[PDB]
Amino acid sequence: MEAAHSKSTEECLAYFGVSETTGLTPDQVKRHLEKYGHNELPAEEGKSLWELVIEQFEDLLVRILLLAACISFVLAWFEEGEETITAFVEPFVILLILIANAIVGVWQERNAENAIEALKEYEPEMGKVYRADRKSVQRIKARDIVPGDIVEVAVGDKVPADIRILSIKSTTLRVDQSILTGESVSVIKHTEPVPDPRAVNQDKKNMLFSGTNIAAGKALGIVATTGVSTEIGKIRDQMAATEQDKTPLQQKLDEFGEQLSKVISLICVAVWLINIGHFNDPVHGGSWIRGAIYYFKIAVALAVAAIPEGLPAVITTCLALGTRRMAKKNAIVRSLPSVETLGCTSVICSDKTGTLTTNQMSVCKMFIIDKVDGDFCSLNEFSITGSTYAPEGEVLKNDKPIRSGQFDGLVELATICALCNDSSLDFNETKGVYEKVGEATETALTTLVEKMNVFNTEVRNLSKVERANACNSVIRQLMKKEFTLEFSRDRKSMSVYCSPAKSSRAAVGNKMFVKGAPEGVIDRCNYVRVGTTRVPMTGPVKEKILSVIKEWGTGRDTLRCLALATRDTPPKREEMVLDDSSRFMEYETDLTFVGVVGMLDPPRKEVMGSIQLCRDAGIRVIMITGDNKGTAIAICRRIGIFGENEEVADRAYTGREFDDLPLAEQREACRRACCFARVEPSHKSKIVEYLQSYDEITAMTGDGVNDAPALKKAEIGIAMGSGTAVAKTASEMVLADDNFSTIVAAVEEGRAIYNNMKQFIRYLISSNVGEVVCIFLTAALGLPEALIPVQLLWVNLVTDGLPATALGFNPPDLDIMDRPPRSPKEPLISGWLFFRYMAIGGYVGAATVGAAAWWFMYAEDGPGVTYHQLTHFMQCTEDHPHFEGLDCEIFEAPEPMTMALSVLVTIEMCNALNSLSENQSLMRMPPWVNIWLLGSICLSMSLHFLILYVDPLPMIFKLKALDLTQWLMVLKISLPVIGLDEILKFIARNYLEG
Ligand SMILES: C/C=C(\C)C(=O)O[C@H]1C(C)=C2[C@H]([C@@H]1OC(=O)CCCCCCC)[C@@](C)(OC(C)=O)C[C@H](O)[C@@]1(O)[C@H]2OC(=O)[C@@]1(C)O
Ligand SMILES: [K+]
Ligand SMILES: [Mg+2]
């Protein structure tokens, strides 16, 4: 292994002590293989059912539930073969919930897709190498490839490992690094070394990366690194090293069951001391075996009451339609839990070109020299029409229609655009729209020359298909192009060498046509061309040139500027070496500046308003772009990220600046910054780390495999629809339209869904709380069971679930996007609210136990010990003459349980309404605001009746229908809830804070 880009061909071959002619000997293989291991990415995490299903049963809330099942199961063996056939139903029900959720968990994981695994798709199975064994090439498993090995690659092949290119057999070698950056555009490679040791991947021109495809050509290369050491391998290591916190909610629930454990144990403690007087009891032992079962059956009934069994379902269901809901809005959410974190986002960093802008290019303005006389200097500024790539536009000076042929500056400028251009234009018949063939920026040049054909070749009659390339073709005829000097970032410009084709025009010999970044290329220009004539460059002219460039790049226009020039007297073709990019800058010198072209990558119509939403929403939006700081800042002010006159000095940074900054100042810039220009690959991961240092819930956009480590780091990684498969798998959500606004829209739902979800959760928790109290009162007083576990399940699973699900449909607040992002820390229930559900819970507690008691006594249908100690009901059979002048089996009766159950159900439908809003009275906030809630409420009651009246059910449940009169008692007991809450709902939004 090594940093082969900086090394020479000979150095690399020397390092490994390998011959380019023969390759590695079999011995060197043995040693190399042992030392460097195999050229493969590590294995998938070993998971098994037996390991999967146990994680299902390792949450506390599932363990105590499991434990409860056994007890009931055991208790149910003690049940007389006659006393109940259905004894075994109670334990089963618990288990089949635990089995059902267990089932749910596993299916989700089987489907879940790892991001690391997506990298493997880039691993080729085969590769071709040269070794000592054979003169002829051998095709082997990429896995068996070792560093220092001689490798052969050709078109179509997927690069097996990171390779230093030794020699290129083909005339030209092109590679497709789209897997990396997302760009389909091929790139030329060279043998000559890269001087910089820290050069970023993009600048390693003498390098081949594992996973990439060869666009064109054939080459021979030495293997620098393999397996984990490759660029892709390093990226895997970053992703493997990265760890993801649990959704804030998730974190809350874990502490919930955590605390719930303590509370549960505490209840038993208290329950035990309340009945401590039992030590001052007869030692006859009579009924001792009996007391245990009762306490045990109380324990299980307690567990189910404490836990909200139905909750898991209710939540996932709500998230599922919310997900489908977002899908309609072009927002694809993978993994439901992320919906919450999606509402909490405080910072969102979005790539410019892909999302924030259309990536649809067109030339708006352009200028050429008009007159250079002494200090006096004048230029010709033009304006072009048409945002589409479609050659349907007009050139106008001072808004007045112009025939381009009139100016000789334009004729030369136009030839440059067409000749120094790789991309073309194609017309598609199916969609009926003009489409770019190659690069967006280049395509708009081919587009321009059409609108301004300086030869005015007639094409109005030409078919639309033939129209697309007409005016370009004519220019391609004029000059034969010998070769081209591709773009390199050092000089930031590209050139072409052209022999004048044909005898009629065969004059002035060969010429060079260069285009690139204004600053760079203008320094090389020693002359300026006015019309046909040419004049030596002077300060004053150069200034007037650069001035308009700044105005166009930094001004309201925010145009990307290209400087077009020609080398009138290029060097002799023979003196030129075309295999080294380093010599390119010296070829492009002594140039004659013809004119510049300004083009725009227009922001999306939806963006401006979407940015404002973030201001209103408290969300900080950070832009990532490729433009130079100057214009980048300009674009920010154009979409509202910055005020036109707002100071930005400390809020805008480039990769260079950021790197120069010390760690402290770096972290500091992150909280301030809203614009990063010319960013390096590592930064995205860094920025996220920093934003997370301030506990910011951050969103990141990525398209390629390099962005992956970042998307997996950021709280919410966002990938494009056009994005690579790997980018998608690492992200939390994918933008189908790639539109930025789609991001903002998702956050709105993220907040909206969470609010309703918050309500139905408290609603379910509250019912639990109340159920625990009843059970506890039942235990402390020694009362007979008001509620049986089986019943509770039904209530928590179904009766509570439906209104809870309906609550998920609550109409959204109007100020959702006017409030700052929710604090992940903030608890669901605290302070006053906690006290509320504390009180309410108590009410339902007393209500249920009391309703069952009111039947045992003071009831016509039931024989009552009015205000007597029915409590000692354990001792009836043995102690019946004393106080028990009646049958003792009466305590088994269902009527009291149904009475107690019924009141619960009714109270719960009420409490559901009180949950329509946290602090808003129902007259202020009717129940009819949400139709579904009322609709679901009716449903739950119907079902409640069902279990009472249909033959098989009431028996199983231990319920019997109650007289109309008995029903009324329920109402007198349950309905008062709304009043209670309304009052606690009248203290807050008035006398408390708020
Ligand atoms: C039945 C449910 C049981 C036990 C149970 O939920 O127990 C407590 C508990 C985990 C919480 C408390 C409960 O306190 C009691 O109900 C005290 C009961 C005393 C009983 C007396 C027996 C002697 C909640 C529910 O209570 C109320 C309404 O505010 C509020 C809120 O959700 C939580 O504070 C929650 O823990 C958290 O992390 C929060 C932020 O979600
Ligand atoms: K994550
Ligand atoms: Mg990128």
PDB file of C-alpha atoms in Angstrom, residues 748-852:
ATOM      1  CA  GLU A 748     -43.786  20.212   8.648  1.00  0.00           C
ATOM      2  CA  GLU A 749     -45.292  16.721   8.630  1.00  0.00           C
ATOM      3  CA  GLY A 750     -42.614  15.615  11.075  1.00  0.00           C
ATOM      4  CA  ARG A 751     -43.899  18.195  13.538  1.00  0.00           C
ATOM      5  CA  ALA A 752     -47.564  17.664  12.697  1.00  0.00           C
ATOM      6  CA  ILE A 753     -47.463  13.884  13.104  1.00  0.00           C
ATOM      7  CA  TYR A 754     -45.513  14.111  16.354  1.00  0.00           C
ATOM      8  CA  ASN A 755     -48.079  16.403  17.981  1.00  0.00           C
ATOM      9  CA  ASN A 756     -51.015  14.032  17.475  1.00  0.00           C
ATOM     10  CA  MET A 757     -48.740  11.133  18.288  1.00  0.00           C
ATOM     11  CA  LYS A 758     -47.874  12.941  21.519  1.00  0.00           C
ATOM     12  CA  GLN A 759     -51.545  13.224  22.468  1.00  0.00           C
ATOM     13  CA  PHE A 760     -52.543   9.619  21.824  1.00  0.00           C
ATOM     14  CA  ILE A 761     -49.499   8.502  23.808  1.00  0.00           C
ATOM     15  CA  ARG A 762     -50.385  10.455  26.939  1.00  0.00           C
ATOM     16  CA  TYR A 763     -53.921   9.218  26.398  1.00  0.00           C
ATOM     17  CA  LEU A 764     -52.721   5.607  26.476  1.00  0.00           C
ATOM     18  CA  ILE A 765     -50.328   6.221  29.364  1.00  0.00           C
ATOM     19  CA  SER A 766     -53.079   7.911  31.378  1.00  0.00           C
ATOM     20  CA  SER A 767     -55.442   4.962  30.993  1.00  0.00           C
ATOM     21  CA  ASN A 768     -52.626   2.715  32.198  1.00  0.00           C
ATOM     22  CA  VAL A 769     -51.997   4.948  35.206  1.00  0.00           C
ATOM     23  CA  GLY A 770     -55.692   4.784  36.118  1.00  0.00           C
ATOM     24  CA  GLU A 771     -55.744   1.006  35.678  1.00  0.00           C
ATOM     25  CA  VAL A 772     -52.776   0.608  38.015  1.00  0.00           C
ATOM     26  CA  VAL A 773     -54.544   2.656  40.709  1.00  0.00           C
ATOM     27  CA  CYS A 774     -57.714   0.571  40.596  1.00  0.00           C
ATOM     28  CA  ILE A 775     -55.605  -2.592  40.883  1.00  0.00           C
ATOM     29  CA  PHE A 776     -53.670  -1.104  43.783  1.00  0.00           C
ATOM     30  CA  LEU A 777     -56.812   0.022  45.614  1.00  0.00           C
ATOM     31  CA  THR A 778     -58.198  -3.464  45.006  1.00  0.00           C
ATOM     32  CA  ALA A 779     -55.095  -4.937  46.658  1.00  0.00           C
ATOM     33  CA  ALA A 780     -54.703  -2.506  49.566  1.00  0.00           C
ATOM     34  CA  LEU A 781     -58.344  -2.788  50.626  1.00  0.00           C
ATOM     35  CA  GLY A 782     -58.493  -6.542  50.095  1.00  0.00           C
ATOM     36  CA  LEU A 783     -61.359  -6.062  47.652  1.00  0.00           C
ATOM     37  CA  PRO A 784     -62.300  -8.678  45.041  1.00  0.00           C
ATOM     38  CA  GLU A 785     -60.927  -8.157  41.526  1.00  0.00           C
ATOM     39  CA  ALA A 786     -62.724  -5.255  39.868  1.00  0.00           C
ATOM     40  CA  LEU A 787     -60.840  -5.863  36.638  1.00  0.00           C
ATOM     41  CA  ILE A 788     -59.269  -8.993  35.203  1.00  0.00           C
ATOM     42  CA  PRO A 789     -56.142  -8.892  32.997  1.00  0.00           C
ATOM     43  CA  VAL A 790     -57.958 -10.306  29.950  1.00  0.00           C
ATOM     44  CA  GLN A 791     -60.365  -7.360  30.135  1.00  0.00           C
ATOM     45  CA  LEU A 792     -57.548  -4.814  30.513  1.00  0.00           C
ATOM     46  CA  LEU A 793     -55.799  -6.202  27.432  1.00  0.00           C
ATOM     47  CA  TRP A 794     -58.925  -5.699  25.325  1.00  0.00           C
ATOM     48  CA  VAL A 795     -59.222  -2.141  26.647  1.00  0.00           C
ATOM     49  CA  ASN A 796     -55.549  -1.249  26.076  1.00  0.00           C
ATOM     50  CA  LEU A 797     -55.346  -3.151  22.792  1.00  0.00           C
ATOM     51  CA  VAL A 798     -58.666  -2.282  21.154  1.00  0.00           C
ATOM     52  CA  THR A 799     -60.970  -0.007  23.166  1.00  0.00           C
ATOM     53  CA  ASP A 800     -58.088   2.409  23.814  1.00  0.00           C
ATOM     54  CA  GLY A 801     -56.319   1.759  20.515  1.00  0.00           C
ATOM     55  CA  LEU A 802     -59.044   2.974  18.162  1.00  0.00           C
ATOM     56  CA  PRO A 803     -59.557   6.379  19.790  1.00  0.00           C
ATOM     57  CA  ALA A 804     -55.765   6.545  20.100  1.00  0.00           C
ATOM     58  CA  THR A 805     -55.403   5.861  16.387  1.00  0.00           C
ATOM     59  CA  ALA A 806     -58.161   8.392  15.712  1.00  0.00           C
ATOM     60  CA  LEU A 807     -56.252  10.941  17.812  1.00  0.00           C
ATOM     61  CA  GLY A 808     -53.401  10.554  15.334  1.00  0.00           C
ATOM     62  CA  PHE A 809     -55.673  12.323  12.859  1.00  0.00           C
ATOM     63  CA  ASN A 810     -56.054  15.495  14.938  1.00  0.00           C
ATOM     64  CA  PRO A 811     -56.229  18.643  12.795  1.00  0.00           C
ATOM     65  CA  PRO A 812     -52.754  20.292  12.773  1.00  0.00           C
ATOM     66  CA  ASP A 813     -51.927  23.586  14.531  1.00  0.00           C
ATOM     67  CA  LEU A 814     -51.773  26.722  12.381  1.00  0.00           C
ATOM     68  CA  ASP A 815     -48.511  27.890  13.937  1.00  0.00           C
ATOM     69  CA  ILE A 816     -46.560  24.641  13.530  1.00  0.00           C
ATOM     70  CA  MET A 817     -44.050  26.394  11.275  1.00  0.00           C
ATOM     71  CA  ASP A 818     -44.078  29.547  13.402  1.00  0.00           C
ATOM     72  CA  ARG A 819     -42.652  27.729  16.422  1.00  0.00           C
ATOM     73  CA  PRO A 820     -38.958  26.805  16.834  1.00  0.00           C
ATOM     74  CA  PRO A 821     -37.998  23.124  16.468  1.00  0.00           C
ATOM     75  CA  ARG A 822     -39.018  20.975  19.456  1.00  0.00           C
ATOM     76  CA  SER A 823     -36.321  20.125  22.007  1.00  0.00           C
ATOM     77  CA  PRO A 824     -35.499  16.397  21.764  1.00  0.00           C
ATOM     78  CA  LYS A 825     -35.052  16.513  25.550  1.00  0.00           C
ATOM     79  CA  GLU A 826     -38.538  17.772  26.435  1.00  0.00           C
ATOM     80  CA  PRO A 827     -40.595  15.023  28.152  1.00  0.00           C
ATOM     81  CA  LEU A 828     -44.144  14.046  27.160  1.00  0.00           C
ATOM     82  CA  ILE A 829     -45.528  14.479  30.670  1.00  0.00           C
ATOM     83  CA  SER A 830     -44.118  16.813  33.330  1.00  0.00           C
ATOM     84  CA  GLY A 831     -45.080  19.437  35.898  1.00  0.00           C
ATOM     85  CA  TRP A 832     -48.774  20.326  35.769  1.00  0.00           C
ATOM     86  CA  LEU A 833     -49.742  17.772  33.122  1.00  0.00           C
ATOM     87  CA  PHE A 834     -48.147  14.972  35.127  1.00  0.00           C
ATOM     88  CA  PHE A 835     -50.217  16.133  38.068  1.00  0.00           C
ATOM     89  CA  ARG A 836     -53.294  16.206  35.830  1.00  0.00           C
ATOM     90  CA  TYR A 837     -52.914  12.605  34.673  1.00  0.00           C
ATOM     91  CA  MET A 838     -51.989  11.864  38.279  1.00  0.00           C
ATOM     92  CA  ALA A 839     -55.351  13.173  39.458  1.00  0.00           C
ATOM     93  CA  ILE A 840     -57.411  11.849  36.536  1.00  0.00           C
ATOM     94  CA  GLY A 841     -55.757   8.452  36.944  1.00  0.00           C
ATOM     95  CA  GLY A 842     -56.773   8.463  40.581  1.00  0.00           C
ATOM     96  CA  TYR A 843     -60.344   9.314  39.615  1.00  0.00           C
ATOM     97  CA  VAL A 844     -60.700   6.379  37.211  1.00  0.00           C
ATOM     98  CA  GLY A 845     -58.979   4.218  39.816  1.00  0.00           C
ATOM     99  CA  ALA A 846     -61.565   4.976  42.491  1.00  0.00           C
ATOM    100  CA  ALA A 847     -64.305   4.923  39.846  1.00  0.00           C
ATOM    101  CA  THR A 848     -63.620   1.370  38.665  1.00  0.00           C
ATOM    102  CA  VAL A 849     -63.057  -0.163  42.100  1.00  0.00           C
ATOM    103  CA  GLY A 850     -66.004   1.856  43.397  1.00  0.00           C
ATOM    104  CA  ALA A 851     -68.349   0.879  40.577  1.00  0.00           C
ATOM    105  CA  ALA A 852     -67.685  -2.799  41.280  1.00  0.00           C
TER     106      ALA A 852
END
